[PDB]
Design a protein around this ligand. Structure first.
Ligand code: HEM
Length: 154
């Protein structure tokens, strides 16, 4: 697929608002993900012992991971489709070391969209949401293809 520039502009415009508080957004998104799809929490050895959302909010480690995840995603979206290099190490670690199925990347894509929708309604109307969804579907499509070359496809 290929986004138009206009679509990239809608995606990077709301992203610039996310970047005003990267740790807060990273917490909100990971907690929305673990509440909605608790099985995903099992992939995190360091955190699968967290029992409630209060514990998750209080975890310093969880907040640090959130910033790591959002910072890598932001770097990929800022490429505007030219993200082959950025994707290579990401695909390798998520396919061989962590073993994250494509289905789980769809789940965090749903959590990202839910959080931007609640925190940025003015910059995340239907056209902006459609553009962010296209950008995350492109991201998932390119990572799924890399998973296949690497021998995981899952
Ligand atoms: C928007 C998509 C995501 C991005 C951009 C991303 C980014 C990252 C990055 C940059 C790291 C640190 C270096 C590395 O190991 O690659 C990481 C680690 C990790 N990620 Fe992902 N990730 C994403 C989705 C997920 C999902 C959906 C899961 C599981 C449901 C996941 C599981 C993990 C695990 C288990 C680690 C190691 C955490 C720790 O160090 O204990 N990631 N991820």
């Amino acid at each position: 697929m290929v986004l138009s520039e206009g679509e990239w502009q809608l995606v990077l415009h709301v992203w610039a608002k996310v970047e005003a508080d990267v740790a807060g957004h990273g917490q909100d998104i990971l907690i929305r993900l673990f509440k909605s799809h608790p099985e995903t929490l099992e992939k995190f050895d360091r955190f699968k012992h967290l029992k409630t959302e209060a514990e998750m909010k209080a975890s310093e480690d969880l907040k640090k991971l959130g910033v790591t995840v959002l910072t890598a995603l932001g770097a990929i979206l800022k490429k505007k489709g030219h993200h082959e290099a950025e994707l290579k190490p990401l695909a390798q670690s998520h396919a061989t070391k962590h073993k994250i199925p494509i289905k789980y990347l769809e789940f965090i894509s749903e959590a990202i969209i839910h959080v931007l929708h609640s925190r940025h309604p003015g910059n995340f109307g239907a056209d902006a949401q459609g553009a962010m969804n296209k950008a995350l579907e492109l991201f998932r499509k390119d990572i799924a293809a890399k998973y296949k070359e690497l021998g995981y496809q899952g």
